[PDB]
Structure formats: structure tokens, C-alpha cells
Amino acid sequence: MEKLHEANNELQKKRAIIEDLEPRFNNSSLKIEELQEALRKKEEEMKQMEERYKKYLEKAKSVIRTLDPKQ
């Protein structure tokens, strides 16, 4: 029982560690998937912001092309 009180003292100490880590890791699988979602959303909003900026650029040159002064 010397050895039993001992292992049991170590046993109490090791599930107070799991009970500390399993949430500190569970909510972290979560953060991985919140950052991945935000990264894909941002990667989209730039894809479109750019395509929105390239188009107004062509709409500018076309209005420029009409306003040819030589004509």
C-alpha cells in the first residue's frame, strides 16, 4: 500500500493534467478551422476586389478611347 498510495497519488495528478489539456487542445482544433475559414474568405475577397479593379480599369480606357482628342 506504500506503493498504492503512491501510484494513486501519481494517478490523481495525471488526470488533473488531461482535464487541463483536453480543452486547451479541443478549442484549438477549433481555432485551426476558424483561421482556415477566414483565410479562404480573405483569399476570395481579394480575388474579387482585384477583378473589380481590373474591370473599372478597362472601363476607364474605353471611355478614354472614345475621348480620343485626335478624332
Partner: protein, 61 residues
């Protein structure tokens, strides 16, 4: 100053209002600026507006 003169001016000047307004103007908004422009050109100088808006949109839409 024939009709082509009035149309072609109308397009050049709506393509400018459409441009400096940051391309906020859409088709019906544009179909109605050309009747304004055409009318006010035959008053300073009929269906011409229809071809004017099509020339405009072509270039801004």
C-alpha cells in the same frame, strides 16, 4: 451639325458623366441620360437616344 454629330457628342459626354461618377450608372440610368442629352441637343441645335445608350453601354457595360 447633323444628327450623327449630336449622337456622337451625346455618347462622348455621357461616357464622361458615367466615368467621373465612378461608373455608378447602369443601363436604365443610362438609357434616360441619352434622351436628356439628345433632346437638349436638338433644342440647342427622335429615337436617336436608343442607339446612343447602346453605344454608351457597349463601352461602359
Amino acid at each position: 451639325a447633323t444628327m450623327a454629330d449630336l449622337k456622337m457628342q451625346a455618347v462622348k459626354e455621357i461616357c464622361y458623366e458615367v466615368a467621373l461618377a465612378d461608373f455608378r450608372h447602369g443601363r436604365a440610368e443610362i438609357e434616360a441620360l441619352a434622351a436628356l442629352k439628345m433632346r437638349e441637343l436638338c433644342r440647342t441645335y427622335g429615337d436617336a437616344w436608343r442607339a446612343v445608350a447602346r453605344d454608351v453601354w457597349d463601352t461602359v457595360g
